[PDB]
Design an enzyme around this catalytic site. Sequence first.
Site, PDB file in Angstrom:
ATOM      1  N   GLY A   1       2.562   5.900  10.306  1.00 50.61           N
ATOM      2  CA  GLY A   1       3.834   5.700   9.922  1.00 50.61           C
ATOM      3  C   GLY A   1       4.394   4.408  10.471  1.00 50.61           C
ATOM      4  O   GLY A   1       5.794   4.343  10.200  1.00 50.61           O
TER       5      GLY A   1
ATOM      6  N   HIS B   1       0.857  -1.168  -0.022  1.00 51.99           N
ATOM      7  CA  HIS B   1      -0.149   0.188   0.045  1.00 51.99           C
ATOM      8  C   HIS B   1       0.785   1.308  -0.081  1.00 51.99           C
ATOM      9  O   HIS B   1       0.363   2.629  -0.006  1.00 51.99           O
ATOM     10  CB  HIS B   1      -1.055   0.029   1.103  1.00 51.99           C
ATOM     11  CG  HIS B   1      -0.703   0.111   2.593  1.00 51.99           C
ATOM     12  ND1 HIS B   1       0.039   1.316   3.033  1.00 51.99           N
ATOM     13  CD2 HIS B   1      -0.666  -0.857   3.586  1.00 51.99           C
ATOM     14  CE1 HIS B   1       0.252   1.014   4.326  1.00 51.99           C
ATOM     15  NE2 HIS B   1      -0.171  -0.135   4.616  1.00 51.99           N
TER      16      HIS B   1
ATOM     17  N   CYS C   1       3.479   1.395   9.650  1.00 48.61           N
ATOM     18  CA  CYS C   1       3.282   0.354   8.607  1.00 48.61           C
ATOM     19  C   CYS C   1       4.772  -0.217   8.301  1.00 48.61           C
ATOM     20  O   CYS C   1       5.850   0.704   7.772  1.00 48.61           O
ATOM     21  CB  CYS C   1       2.559   0.658   7.484  1.00 48.61           C
ATOM     22  SG  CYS C   1       1.004   1.237   7.845  1.00 48.61           S
TER      23      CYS C   1
HETATM   24  O1  QK3 Z   1      -0.530   4.859   4.817  1.00 43.34           O
HETATM   25  C1  QK3 Z   1      -1.807   4.822   4.448  1.00 43.34           C
HETATM   26  C2  QK3 Z   1      -2.462   6.173   4.214  1.00 43.34           C
HETATM   27  N1  QK3 Z   1      -2.484   6.634   2.734  1.00 43.34           N
HETATM   28  C3  QK3 Z   1      -2.715   7.905   2.252  1.00 43.34           C
HETATM   29  C4  QK3 Z   1      -2.317   7.699   1.073  1.00 43.34           C
HETATM   30  N2  QK3 Z   1      -2.099   6.338   0.387  1.00 43.34           N
HETATM   31  C5  QK3 Z   1      -2.102   5.601   1.615  1.00 43.34           C
HETATM   32  N3  QK3 Z   1      -2.704   3.859   4.769  1.00 43.34           N
HETATM   33  C6  QK3 Z   1      -2.478   3.121   5.971  1.00 43.34           C
HETATM   34  C7  QK3 Z   1      -3.709   2.838   6.947  1.00 43.34           C
HETATM   35  C8  QK3 Z   1      -3.605   2.338   8.265  1.00 43.34           C
HETATM   36  O2  QK3 Z   1      -4.548   1.807   8.717  1.00 43.34           O
HETATM   37  N4  QK3 Z   1      -2.428   2.604   8.790  1.00 43.34           N
HETATM   38  C9  QK3 Z   1      -1.962   2.739  10.422  1.00 43.34           C
HETATM   39  C10 QK3 Z   1      -1.074   1.836  10.673  1.00 43.34           C
HETATM   40  N5  QK3 Z   1      -1.060   1.715  12.020  1.00 43.34           N
HETATM   41  C11 QK3 Z   1      -1.823   2.461  12.968  1.00 43.34           C
HETATM   42  C12 QK3 Z   1      -2.614   3.493  12.408  1.00 43.34           C
HETATM   43  C13 QK3 Z   1      -2.825   4.753  13.328  1.00 43.34           C
HETATM   44  C14 QK3 Z   1      -3.484   5.915  12.873  1.00 43.34           C
HETATM   45  C15 QK3 Z   1      -3.806   5.826  11.344  1.00 43.34           C
HETATM   46  C16 QK3 Z   1      -3.376   4.799  10.682  1.00 43.34           C
HETATM   47  C17 QK3 Z   1      -2.879   3.602  11.147  1.00 43.34           C
HETATM   48  C18 QK3 Z   1      -4.625   4.194   6.892  1.00 43.34           C
HETATM   49  C19 QK3 Z   1      -6.072   4.079   7.220  1.00 43.34           C
HETATM   50  O3  QK3 Z   1      -6.574   3.059   5.978  1.00 43.34           O
HETATM   51  C20 QK3 Z   1      -5.896   1.970   5.693  1.00 43.34           C
HETATM   52  C21 QK3 Z   1      -6.717   0.886   5.155  1.00 43.34           C
HETATM   53  C22 QK3 Z   1      -5.981  -0.254   4.730  1.00 43.34           C
HETATM   54  C23 QK3 Z   1      -4.454  -0.384   4.759  1.00 43.34           C
HETATM   55 CL1  QK3 Z   1      -3.987  -1.861   4.750  1.00 43.34          CL
HETATM   56  C24 QK3 Z   1      -3.648   0.476   5.667  1.00 43.34           C
HETATM   57  C25 QK3 Z   1      -4.528   1.816   5.991  1.00 43.34           C
END
Ligand code: QK3
EC number: 3.4.19.12
Lengths: 305, 301
Positions: free
Chosen positions: B143, B41, B145
């Site tokens: 951040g 992602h 991930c």
């Molecule tokens: O980094 C991007 C955001 N993005 C922009 C542009 N492209 C991407 N996404 C990762 C995301 C996720 O969940 N990660 C995070 C992991 N750990 C803690 C977290 C705490 C707060 C906020 C996000 C968190 C965002 C939410 O939606 C999803 C949905 C699916 C997946 Cl696999 C990934 C995510």
Amino acid sequence: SGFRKMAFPSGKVEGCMVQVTCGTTTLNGLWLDDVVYCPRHVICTSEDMLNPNYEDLLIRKSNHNFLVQAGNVQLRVIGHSMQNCVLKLKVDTANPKTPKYKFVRIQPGQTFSVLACYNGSPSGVYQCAMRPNFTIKGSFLNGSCGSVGFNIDYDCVSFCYMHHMELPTGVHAGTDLEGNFYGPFVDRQTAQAAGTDTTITVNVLAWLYAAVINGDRWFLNRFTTTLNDFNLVAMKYNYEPLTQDHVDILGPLSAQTGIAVLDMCASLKELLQNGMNGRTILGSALLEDEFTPFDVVRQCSGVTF
Amino acid sequence: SGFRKMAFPSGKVEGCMVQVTCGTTTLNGLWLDDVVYCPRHVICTSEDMLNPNYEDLLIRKSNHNFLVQAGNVQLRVIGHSMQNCVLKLKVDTANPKTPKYKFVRIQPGQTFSVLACYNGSPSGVYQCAMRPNFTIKGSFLNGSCGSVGFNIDYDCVSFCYMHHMELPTGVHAGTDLEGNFYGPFVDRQTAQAAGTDTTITVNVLAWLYAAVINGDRWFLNRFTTTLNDFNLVAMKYNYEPLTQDHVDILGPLSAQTGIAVLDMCASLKELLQNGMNGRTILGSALLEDEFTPFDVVRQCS
Ligand SMILES: O=C(Cn1ccnc1)NC[C@@]1(C(=O)Nc2cncc3ccccc23)CCOc2ccc(Cl)cc21
Ligand SMILES: O=C(Cn1ccnc1)NC[C@@]1(C(=O)Nc2cncc3ccccc23)CCOc2ccc(Cl)cc21
């Protein structure tokens, strides 16, 4: 989201762990520059431990009696000296993996990471607190002596603890890296007992702030308290007194959550007098006191090393 | 003596953490030999998080679009491929700090250490269990991930988890190092919910054995139970069923303490009915389920 008991990354300390053998005793040593630090009781026998004269025992030792092993390489001991309850073995090689480091003595309530080792090999890392009775509730087996406690500030390792012994209740006692024991303990096989422990009040408040940051608000109430009324109540439940310093340290968490420290204190007062009533805070049914205010800010803001 | 939630020393994994940037997104990568592994992602934009076509997005990327940073050194990406939900960036340098390693897919109830990272830099290490609902109760911010879960066997690191997302309840979902998600999760922002979680019964039993080894016996009773009666009671408290495999795995702890598994099962049934009555077990007022039988033996003996 989430709140875990989290230790500092142990890599910088793992590169310093060595095995120290003296006669039949094998324990861990910390190799920094050209010196290996370890508990001075490595020179004792079971009889010597009963009432040891460490100056007398050490004068009888020669450099070749101390076998130091860094991985699968034997280090050559070229000098030996004692500083309080720590033995310093001068070696012929500076540890190339020596990180930026300091020796710091911590105060009760302060937390640190422990790298538990056996035979100079790191086996686990866990986060704990220096209890107000100067013991640590560690997890240590025979052979773990010389395992160290540390914190990391930027890229600098502050070594704050070296494991020396286990008390009869299963709690642990040790020294700073200058060999000064934390608490009224001595390195001798004799009757020693940990004093009655108390709860680290400032740390419980910091953990209640962490729970609020994570969405757990059920314990919040409309009330506030004076610092003196809070301390009068806290003393009754064997909680450490909360000082104006502690209130100031909780300032940033108070600003972030909108809950004044004395407002959080009134929540803690009710929690002590009434309990949790079947509820939990951050997955715990007890009030957690092994997260300092700095640990909470560091974890809830993602500081790296 | 003493029983702590203990993580593996993180040094071998720290020397593998790198920062991966793709456009405006920055996350963590795992650098092993000449390959950097990270969540696929990282290639997604704002318009691509609901229904991303990763094959379509990746074909449009070139090697110079992926910025990989190992400390203060930029690595050169010379190839890119996708394996399930993981992106594999071939780099021109083998990681000199690559430990002996394996990729292992774990089962629910299994525990592992997490090295939480931000911008390719390790910030903390903690212990987790793969929940029966295939989520992990981690501590992760935006951040994180690409942060990985692992175990260590002697000098070999077994990578078992890579962090991909946070679900609405604050629990976390991710994949093994082959990019296969744990649980029915997908790397899309489409409505996803963790199933109702349950307690890892075999782990609670292992922790009750740890408490006995440490001198805590107050919860023991004179009763035994059948496996089926234990499971009938256990399900009512949302505890996972205990299988004959779990009973067998608890064999060594049963032999060491002299308490038969079904005898300990009857203590657990009693604790579930009465609660603790102001008492603690190994400093805890709740029954702990994030220590496997293997963790207990390792920590105690
Ligand atoms: O980094 C991007 C955001 N993005 C922009 C542009 N492209 C991407 N996404 C990762 C995301 C996720 O969940 N990660 C995070 C992991 N750990 C803690 C977290 C705490 C707060 C906020 C996000 C968190 C965002 C939410 O939606 C999803 C949905 C699916 C997946 Cl696999 C990934 C995510
Ligand atoms: O390492 C040796 C040598 N040794 C060889 C075999 N048995 C012991 N002795 C250290 C000792 C101690 O307490 N350490 C240990 C540390 N951590 C956990 C422990 C768990 C079980 C048993 C010992 C533990 C033994 C008990 O008497 C004392 C008294 C004072 C001091 Cl400073 C040190 C010790």
